[PDB]
Write a protein that binds this ligand. Structure first.
Ligand SMILES: C=CC(C)(C)OC[C@H]1O[C@H](O[C@@H]2C3=C([C@H](C)COC(C)=O)C[C@H](O)[C@]3(C)/C=C3/[C@@H](COC)CC[C@H]3[C@@H](C)[C@H]2O)[C@H](O)[C@@H](O)[C@@H]1O
Ligand SMILES: C=CC(C)(C)OC[C@H]1O[C@H](O[C@@H]2C3=C([C@H](C)COC(C)=O)C[C@H](O)[C@]3(C)/C=C3/[C@@H](COC)CC[C@H]3[C@@H](C)[C@H]2O)[C@H](O)[C@@H](O)[C@@H]1O
Ligand SMILES: [Mg+2]
Ligand SMILES: [Mg+2]
Ligand SMILES: [Mg+2]
Ligand SMILES: [Mg+2]
Ligand SMILES: [Mg+2]
Ligand SMILES: [Mg+2]
Lengths: 5, 236, 236, 5
């Protein structure tokens, strides 16, 4: 799953 | 609020204890109480606020995605009618998630953003505003959907403009803002090319600025850079 | 209660959705509503009830242990006085945990246990009663501590007596009851020898009965047997 | 940590 922070 | 009687310093101390105990709902309630004391937050305090709510809403969003997937499968051809329960429970989780987003956006609007003048606080809060409008956009399906999306875009764009003028390209807040705005472009705004271009440009400009950094700052910046690279690998 | 207006079958369906979404607080609230419809629970429904509350209280207990450890370190020689906050927050988590235990014990007393006549339901509910008194005993420090411990013991002992008379030694409920009562002996009742003897006897008698089982039942029983062996390895 | 179920 794509990364966010 | 229920935290009105507790000292600011005690709320911060308890937020740190809640973090150690992985009690993120409590952490968020303590940090909301701290914000509501009306004083600006330090750098460390901003991180406690953001981590608390990121974890609360992260769990709600993960649950929403599970239930939404079940709901979609229940509306396919050949699926047995199981009644209103899946929709009802997805709506319950959705409404709770929206409530948390509204709470965060309210703290940012009353009055964290208007009092934030240094780049490191203003960009941080505007990133948060974009994030929480983005989480509202993930579940939105109504007349206001386009306005929710544009609210996320507008907050991210202001944060981007400040970050490019006032922060080095390796600054972790600038990098994390770019990571999330790129994801916004990819999966909310139907702009994968913009998402990829932003992630690539952000990574390359940070690479070129690493030479100015200490070992500790170098470690901090390269961590988020790897997330940009991870997304680029997934998308290309 | 807040679930009084929802159909029993819908509460069960939503508890299963909550389990899939790892929303254990919701799961527990749905199953409390189902119990409060006043009908007996099936085997599958009992498992949903127990899993929901085991996970809710498990998280609370893990958080309590983190905070209790911090509190103990703060009361050692040379530790800087940090004020009442650690104790206060440990007490907050403790009171919430006790509330959940009281809720479960209330459901068992009103009226799950009195209506449970088959061994598989009666032993299950009495194990739960022992478990939730045991969780109360983990945090108790007052005049009632010995009575809480004896309440856990009494419930476990009745469950043990029924299980030995009415269930085969490989029955998973009988095995799990023995695992937990052995842990009660080890770490609540200061009886490690009794804990070890119970775990060993339970394991050996189950081993001797495996030959009567199908492949699926064999898998189910040997799983809890490995937990007994794990505890014996830790304790010897 | 010891096991319960
Ligand atoms: C709850 C607070 C505790 C656990 C004490 O600290 C959390 C982390 O805060 C720090 O990093 C920040 C940070 C993270 C880093 C990527 C963590 O990876 C390290 C070792 O850098 C993830 C967190 O979500 C947080 C607070 C959030 C953000 C986003 C916030 O957008 C509103 C922008 C990028 C990034 C910035 C602010 C990072 O600077 C430290 O530098 C870390 O050491 C530390 O783990
Ligand atoms: C929420 C419900 C879902 C996830 C659908 O099912 C949970 C599990 O229920 C079943 O096992 C039970 C079970 C567990 C097993 C050890 C799970 O390991 C398997 C594959 O046996 C752990 C659970 O805490 C539960 C419900 C609880 C207990 C204790 C309850 O003391 C009041 C006594 C021992 C054990 C018994 C009852 C097990 O029989 C199935 O047999 C499993 O397949 C399934 O995973
Ligand atoms: Mg004060
Ligand atoms: Mg809705
Ligand atoms: Mg192209
Ligand atoms: Mg009815
Ligand atoms: Mg107390
Ligand atoms: Mg001995």
């Amino acid at each position: 799953r794509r990364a966010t922070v | 609020g229920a935290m009105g009687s507790m000292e600011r310093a005690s709320l911060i101390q308890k937020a740190k204890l809640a973090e150690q105990a992985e009690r993120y709902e409590d952490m968020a309630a303590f940090m909301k109480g701290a914000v509501e004391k009306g004083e600006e937050l330090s750098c460390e305090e901003r991180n406690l606020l953001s981590v608390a709510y990121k974890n609360v809403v992260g769990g709600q969003r993960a649950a929403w995605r599970v239930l939404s997937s079940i709901e979609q499968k229940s509306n396919e051809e050949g699926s047995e009618e199981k009644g209103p329960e899946v929709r009802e429970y997805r709506e319950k989780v959705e409404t709770e998630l929206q409530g948390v987003c509204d709470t965060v956006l309210g703290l940012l609007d009353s009055h964290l953003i208007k009092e934030a003048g240094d780049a490191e606080s203003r960009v941080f809060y505007l990133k948060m505003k974009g994030d929480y409008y983005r989480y509202l956009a993930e579940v939105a399906t109504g007349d206001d959907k386009k306005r929710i999306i544009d609210s996320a875009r507008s907050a991210y764009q202001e944060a981007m403009d400040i970050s490019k003028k006032e922060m080095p390209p390796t600054n972790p807040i600038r990098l994390g803002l770019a990571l999330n705005f790129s994801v916004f472009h990819y999966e909310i705004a139907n702009s994968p090319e913009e998402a990829i271009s932003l992630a690539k440009t952000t990574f390359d400009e940070a690479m070129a600025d690493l030479h100015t950094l200490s070992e500790d700052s170098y470690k901090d910046s390269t961590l988020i850079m790897q997330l940009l690279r991870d997304n680029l690998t997934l998308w290309t």
